[PDB]
């Protein structure tokens, strides 16, 4: 995950050993309460055994502002609001800004804001993992061509359901895209297998047309490879309404469900067959 921004501020702005913050532990070095080594503080030279007692009995007061602001800047960098190389001049720009107008009011709403940016950073990784930015884009695409109005059969409803299901499931965040004009599904973020989904202008006239089963090479064998790719991509989400004779589209789905099956059982038997991988036959 992306870390806690306030931890990553404190970790780079604060004392590495004992501070004038962790008073409770300093008063167990002093008083010999520390169960792991009681007599350690008793053996310090007077030169630092005595000044440590002073800072514990009358603590130094400090200004917390730089730790508040840096816990914002680290958050802005992680949320990608700013380039990481801007963090020194964004830190400075905020430090002068909040010092110029400094007050007890400002100091409180910096504190409010440090909690807010810490939560916003935790929320942003959820908002990338949940894929919602893709599910909204799919739900926008489904407004673009006749929703709930097929012609030859309503297996169109099952196929639309398989898109929503797939784009909810697939955890590399299959990206639905508005394009410049047409809507696209990218699948995996490395894009090799992108479908232009507004080019399911094929898969319009084909709902209900029965399979010409004896030979796939025939008059109605129309589909563009972009459309065959969409069928091959959704295939592991599709038994509902697609059984062979229900359409040529049903037949393609019954072949591609099993072609994916074949690919992953041939992987399971390839990674077996390649056992030696080196000369021995």
């Amino acid at each position: 995950q992306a870390p806690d921004p306030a931890i990553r501020a404190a970790l780079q702005s604060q004392p590495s050993g004992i501070a004038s913050d962790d008073w409770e532990a300093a008063m167990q070095r002093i008083m010999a309460l520390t169960t792991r080594n009681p007599e350690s503080f008793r053996q310090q030279p007077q030169a630092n055994r005595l000044s440590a007692i002073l800072e514990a009995v009358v603590p130094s007061r400090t200004n917390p502002t730089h730790e508040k602001v840096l816990a914002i800047v680290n958050a802005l960098a992680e949320n990608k609001a700013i380039r990481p190389d801007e963090a020194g001049l964004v830190y400075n720009a905020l430090l002068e800004r909040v010092g110029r107008y400094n007050s007890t009011n400002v100091q409180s709403n910096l504190d409010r804001l440090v909690t807010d940016v810490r939560e916003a950073v935790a929320q942003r990784e959820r908002f990338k993992n949940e894929g919602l930015g893709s599910l909204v884009a799919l739900n926008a695409f489904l407004a673009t061509q006749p929703a709930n109005v097929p012609r030859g059969q309503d297996d169109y409803t099952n196929f639309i359901s398989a898109l929503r299901l797939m784009v909810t499931e697939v955890p590399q965040s299959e990206v639905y895209q508005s394009g410049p004009d047409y809507f696209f599904q990218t699948s995996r973020q490395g894009l090799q297998t992108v479908n232009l989904s507004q080019a399911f202008k094929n898969l319009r006239g084909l709902w209900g047309v029965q399979a010409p089963v004896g030979d796939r090479s025939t008059v109605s064998s129309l589909l563009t490879p972009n459309s065959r790719l969409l069928l091959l991509l959704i295939a592991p989400f599709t038994d509902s309404g697609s059984v062979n004779r229900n359409s040529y589209l049903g037949h393609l789905l019954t072949l591609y469900r099993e072609a994916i099956g074949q690919a992953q059982v041939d992987e399971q038997t390839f990674q077996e067959i390649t056992s030696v991988s080196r000369a021995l036959g």
């Binding site: 801007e86 001049l89 964004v90 400075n92 720009a93 002068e96």
Partner: protein, 50 residues
């Protein structure tokens, strides 16, 4: 000029007068907006320069 033409040397010069010379403080010399890219870098630089 002509057949009795004398040995010769050439002088090249130019004029542009209503103009005043310009040098844009821009990372390439084009007008890509009114507030130039280098003009913004110098805000984020938060520093004085001679």
């Amino acid at each position: 000029i002509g057949q009795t033409a004398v040995p010769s040397v050439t002088q090249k010069k130019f004029l542009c007068d209503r103009v005043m010379w310009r040098i844009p403080f821009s990372s390439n010399f084009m007008s890509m907006g009114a507030l130039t890219d280098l003009g913004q870098n110098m805000l984020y630089a938060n520093s004085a320069h001679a």
